[PDB]
Structure formats: C-alpha cells, structure tokens
Amino acid sequence: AEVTGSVSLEALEEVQVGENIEVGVGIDELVNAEAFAYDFTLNYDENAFEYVEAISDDGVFVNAKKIEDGKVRVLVSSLTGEPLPAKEVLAKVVLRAEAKTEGSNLSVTNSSVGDGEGLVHEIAGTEKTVNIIEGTSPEIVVNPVRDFKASEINKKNVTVTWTEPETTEGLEGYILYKDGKKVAEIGKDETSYTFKKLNRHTIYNFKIAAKYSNGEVSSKESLTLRTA
Numbered sequence: 001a002e003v004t005g006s007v008s009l010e011a012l013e014e015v016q017v018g019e020n021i022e023v024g025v026g027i028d029e030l031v032n033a034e035a036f037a038y039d040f041t042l043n044y045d046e047n048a049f050e051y052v053e054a055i056s057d058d059g060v061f062v063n064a065k066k067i068e069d070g071k072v073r074v075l076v077s078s079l080t081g082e083p084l085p086a087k088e089v090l091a092k093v094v095l096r097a098e099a100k101t102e103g104s105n106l107s108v109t110n111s112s113v114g115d116g117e118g119l120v121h122e123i124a125g126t127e128k129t130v131n132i133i134e135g136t137s138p139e140i141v142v143n144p145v146r147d148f149k150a151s152e153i154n155k156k157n158v159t160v161t162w163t164e165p166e167t168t169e170g171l172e173g174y175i176l177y178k179d180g181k182k183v184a185e186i187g188k189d190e191t192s193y194t195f196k197k198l199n200r201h202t203i204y205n206f207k208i209a210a211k212y213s214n215g216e217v218s219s220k221e222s223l224t225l226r227t228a
Contacts, residue, residue, distance in 0.1 A: 005030035005123035007040060007108040010089060015097045016135035020052060024089035025074070025108055033121050034083035037114035038076040042093050046070040048101040048132055052094040060084070062091045084113075103129040140170040140214045148208055148221035151192065155228040159194040160206055162221070170213035177207040177220070185211070202227050 008028040015021045025040060044051075046069035054064030054074055063075040076091050078084050107127035112120050143165035152159040165171060176184040176193050184193065195206060203226045210218040 001032050003031065003033040003113075003121035003123075005033075005113065005121070007111045007123065007126045008087070008089075009106060009108055009126045009128050011106060011128055011130055014131040014133060016133045017097050017100060018135045019097050021049075021095050021097060021130070022055070023093045023095060023106060024091075025093065026088050026090045027084065027086045027113070027123070028126065030086055030113065030123065033113060033115050035086075035113035036078050036083055036116060038084055038090065039110070039112055039114075040074050040076075040108045041067070041110040042072045042074065043105075043107045043109055044070055044095060045101065045104050048097070048099055048104040049095040050098050052096050055092040055094060056090065060090055064091070064093065097132045097135075099132060100134045101132045104132055105129055138169050140212050140216065141167040142212050142216045142218045143167045143210065144218045144221050145174065145208050145210055146221075148223060150206075150223055150225055153225060153228055154198075155200045156198050157194055157196045158198060158204070158206070158225070158227065159192060160208070160223065161192045162208060163191075164188070165210045165218060171210060172213050173211050175209045175211055175217065177205075177209075179205050180207075198227050200227055 006028045008026040010024040051066050051072050054062050056062040059080040061077040061079050065073050067073050109125045111123045114120050145162040147163040151161040171188050173187045205224050207220040207222045209220045
C-alpha cells in the first residue's frame with residue numbers, strides 16, 4: 001500500500017434520441033491491490049438519459065440497481081477465481097437517449113475495489129461528455145400519382161397506368177375509384193390497373209389517389225372517357 005487507482009469509461013461521442021447507448025466501465029489503473037470486486041456509481045442527466053439495464057460477460061457477475069433516476073449502483077464480481085482484469089470493459093450500463101442535449105455529462109463516482117480478504121479500497125472516478133441529437137423521422141410529404149392515362153380502352157374493360165408520386169417517403173399504395181366510388185386498393189409495386197365489367201360505348205370516370213403510411217391520402221388524378 002497505499003492503494004490507488006482509477007475508473008475507465010468508454011462511450012460513443014454522440015447518440016440520437018430513441019437510441020440506447022452502452023456505457024462500458026472498467027478499471028483504468030490499480031496499484032498495490034488486486035480487485036476481486038468493484039463497485040461504482042454511474043451518474044447521468046435523468047432529463048437526457050434513462051437507465052435500461054446492465055450487461056456483462058460470462059466470468060463477471062453484475063448486480064446493477066438504480067439508486068434514483070440519474071444514479072445507478074453497479075456491483076461487479078469476478079466469477080473466475082481470479083481478480084478482475086484492468087484495462088478492460090467490465091460492465092456495460094445501457095442508457096436510453098431521451099432528449100436532444102449538448103455535452104451531457106457521464107461520470108463514475110463512489111468507486112472502490114474489494115481485495116482478497118474483503119478489504120475495500122477507494123479509487124478515483126472518471127467522466128466523459130456525450131452529445132444527444134434529435135433522431136427525427138423523415139417528413140411524409142403527400143403527392144398525387146403522375147402520368148395518369150388509359151393505356152388501353154377496350155369495349156368492356158379499360159387499363160390505366162401511372163407513374164409514382166414526386167415524394168415517395170412513406171408511400172404505401174394507391175386507391176382506385178370508378179364514377180365516384182372506391183373499387184380497389186393496391187400496393188405501391190403496382191403501376192397499372194384494369195377496370196373490368198364495363199359496358200360498350202359508355203362514359204366512365206376513373207380516379208386514383210396515393211396513400212401514405214401516416215394514413216394521409218393525396219389529391220386524386222382523374223380520367224373521363226368512353227369505352228370502345
């Protein structure tokens with residue numbers, strides 16, 4: 001003795017809201033003692049992050065508990081019959097990013113190790129800052145099909161074709177109408193539709209709308225035409 005040391009903390013420098021981040025904690029350095037157990041407290045901004053779980057490998061046992069939002073107590077124990085190794089991630093504390101925030105602090109405090117006879121030795125803490133960014137989903141922008149036309153006008157049927165809308169984010173399919181009533185809903189993989197059971201020499205109105213994953217529906221494109 002006397003016993004000295006310090007914690008290691010590894011994380012990615014940036015994370016987006018809705019993501020988990022894995023905070024790897026270990027022992028950076030330890031002098032004049034071997035660590036069979038290692039206790040530490042992870043501190044975080046509870047408005048920025050939420051605790052999820054703690055996660056370790058086979059030969060480490062981890063008791064992790066939340067003290068209060070912002071503070072997780074982690075008890076790490078070797079299960080190998082050997083001391084915990086230094087310069088390695090020993091436990092991973094998984095946090096859920098909750099809010100856009102710049103330079104959010106992550107710190108390990110109240111750190112100590114237990115030696116072979118169960119004597120406990122305080123070791124120095126560590127900190128790191130992390131940037132949380134918005135994660136936001138892309139804007140769903142609704143637009144009509146294009147190039148809507150009858151590719152074939154027969155006596156008793158009519159095939160219509162079209163081109164996809166200008167905006168395809170969250171495009172799901174198309175709805176088809178004849179003389180002001182819905183006749184079909186189809187997938188976005190379809191580019192053509194045949195209206196069957198028509199009367200010869202007869203005027204019809206045909207319309208199509210594009211339908212989007214948010215439940216929104218585009219303006220309708222319309223054809224009026226008479227069968228052969």
